[PDB]
Write an enzyme that holds these catalytic residues in place. Structure first.
Site, PDB file in Angstrom:
ATOM      1  N   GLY A  42     -29.400  40.504 -18.640  1.00  0.00           N
ATOM      2  CA  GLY A  42     -29.450  41.946 -18.511  1.00  0.00           C
ATOM      3  C   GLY A  42     -30.013  42.316 -17.898  1.00  0.00           C
ATOM      4  N   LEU A  62     -38.317  33.511 -23.376  1.00  0.00           N
ATOM      5  CA  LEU A  62     -37.052  32.885 -24.124  1.00  0.00           C
ATOM      6  C   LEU A  62     -36.004  32.591 -23.635  1.00  0.00           C
ATOM      7  CD1 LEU A  62     -37.967  34.546 -27.737  1.00  0.00           C
ATOM      8  CD2 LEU A  62     -38.285  31.788 -27.245  1.00  0.00           C
ATOM      9  N   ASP A  81     -18.240  43.145 -28.585  1.00  0.00           N
ATOM     10  CA  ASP A  81     -18.723  41.920 -28.029  1.00  0.00           C
ATOM     11  C   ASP A  81     -19.223  41.223 -28.384  1.00  0.00           C
ATOM     12  OD1 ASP A  81     -19.365  40.784 -25.050  1.00  0.00           O
ATOM     13  OD2 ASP A  81     -21.507  41.820 -24.657  1.00  0.00           O
ATOM     14  N   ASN A 130     -23.932  35.812 -27.937  1.00  0.00           N
ATOM     15  CA  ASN A 130     -25.147  36.245 -29.003  1.00  0.00           C
ATOM     16  C   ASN A 130     -24.527  36.484 -30.732  1.00  0.00           C
ATOM     17  OD1 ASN A 130     -22.362  37.800 -29.129  1.00  0.00           O
ATOM     18  ND2 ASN A 130     -22.799  39.020 -27.665  1.00  0.00           N
TER      19      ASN A 130
END
Lengths: 285, 129
Positions: free
Chosen positions: A25, A21, A138, A143
């Site tokens: 990081g 996918l 964040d 996200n």
């Protein structure tokens, strides 16, 4: 080096590794299939070689501890975690429609009802986080994941923190947020209001088609953040323009709380579509 | 920028510009930052003449974007019948699966594009795919 089958010794469930996918990081993500049930999940796979200590190791641990405690319609579902000698495996709700980032790259500025539609869900998820004393810290397009019904699920709790006592001022982060709130730049510490700042930046990005502060050099960007220098174009509607302003204020205490945000005119009036067509991932409705 | 130019010309529906860029050696299989090709962008935008031009010059009929949409997925969901036919004539996989495992027929049924459903069925779409 990644195993083709993932075996959880605690739960006894085993998973077949599938479609890659994406990386992000320290982790690669694959679709994983329960060998018995045939259910599909996002398997987030982190090599321990990269969990070589401080901010990265416990950013893995803190993230797992926080995420696993959460359960909400607008938060990525946590299904479990295990490890072998080489990797840490995290089993998450699979959101098959990528994130708001991919949407943004294709669409740039959305129509206001689409923005309203996404933003209400983002706020509701974040409200649930705040009520459970979690600051995400964040929030960003990448996200904010979309499932097959184009429902938003907040994920990526790597920078998140738990407010442990009332009036607590967080001083440290485990990394660098995408949208730095002005109080993070300052020496005064931060709390829940950082998530409202980032929702402001997101709201601006969805409606305008570009980020509020970001310039080509980081020094000028941070300076504009510090000075509250940004400009809302005139084609933005008054109610939306005014709500962006409420969120994008230097003084954290001047911003609406997450519940006041949810209750804004922007959300209680204005159109929210019953359904966004799948075409909205590529062209305007 | 020849790839980029073509992507934009194909999106904009600028038919002459596309022919000139291809004759200039522009990559018919250029991709943008979410995996969209000129064929994708012409299909989703309803630019029929451009789709045909791209295919005749060997554009990848079954190229998939970041979502796993082929140009056929995008034409089917937006209701562009003539393009759905064209893509099919040039061997587009009628049962191509995106990353949700949806075929162009699933996507068209969900958008209420029933004439598309009907054509896709005629071209051998499997409902139980």
């Amino acid at each position: 080096e990644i195993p083709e089958v993932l075996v959880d010794p605690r739960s006894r469930r085993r998973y077949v590794r599938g479609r890659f996918l994406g990386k992000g990081g320290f982790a690669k993500c694959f679709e994983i299939s329960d060998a018995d049930t045939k259910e599909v999940f996002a398997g987030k796979i982190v090599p321990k070689s990269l969990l070589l200590k401080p901010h990265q190791r416990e950013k893995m641990s803190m993230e797992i501890s926080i995420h696993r405690s959460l359960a909400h319609q607008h938060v990525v579902g946590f299904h479990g975690f295990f490890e072998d000698n080489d990797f840490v495996f995290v089993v998450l709700e699979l959101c098959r429609r990528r994130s708001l980032l991919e949407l943004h790259k294709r669409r740039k500025a959305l129509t206001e009802p689409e923005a309203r539609y996404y933003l209400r869900q983002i706020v509701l998820g974040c409200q649930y986080l705040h009520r459970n004393r979690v600051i995400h810290r964040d929030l960003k397009l990448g996200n904010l994941f979309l499932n097959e019904d184009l429902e938003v699920k907040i994920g990526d709790f790597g920078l998140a923190t738990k407010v442990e006592y009332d009036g607590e001022r967080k001083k440290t982060l485990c990394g660098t947020p995408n949208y730095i709130a002005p109080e993070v730049l300052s020496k005064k510490g931060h709390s829940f209001e950082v998530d409202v700042w980032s929702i402001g930046c997101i709201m601006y990005t969805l409606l305008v088609g570009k980020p509020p502060f970001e310039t080509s050099c980081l020094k000028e960007t941070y300076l504009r953040i510090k000075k509250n220098e940004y400009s809302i174009p005139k084609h933005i509607n008054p109610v939306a323009a005014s709500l962006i302003q409420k969120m994008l204020q230097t003084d954290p205490t001047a911003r609406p709380t997450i519940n006041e945000l949810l209750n804004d005119e922007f959300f209680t009036s204005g159109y929210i579509p019953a359904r966004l067509p799948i075409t909205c991932l590529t062209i305007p409705p | 920028d020849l790839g980029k130019k073509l992507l934009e010309a194909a999106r904009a529906g600028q038919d002459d510009e596309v022919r000139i860029l291809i004759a200039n050696g522009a990559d018919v299989n250029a991709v943008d930052n979410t995996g969209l090709t000129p064929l994708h962008l012409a299909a989703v935008s309803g630019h029929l003449e451009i789709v045909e031009v791209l295919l005749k010059h060997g554009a990848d009929v079954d190229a998939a974007d970041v979502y796993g949409f082929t140009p056929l997925h995008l034409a089917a969901m937006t209701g562009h019948l003539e393009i759905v036919e064209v893509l099919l004539k040039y061997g587009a996989d009628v049962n191509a699966f995106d990353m949700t495992g949806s075929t162009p027929l699933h996507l068209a049924a969900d958008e209420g594009h029933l004439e598309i459903v009907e054509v896709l069925l005629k071209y051998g779409a499997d409902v139980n795919a």
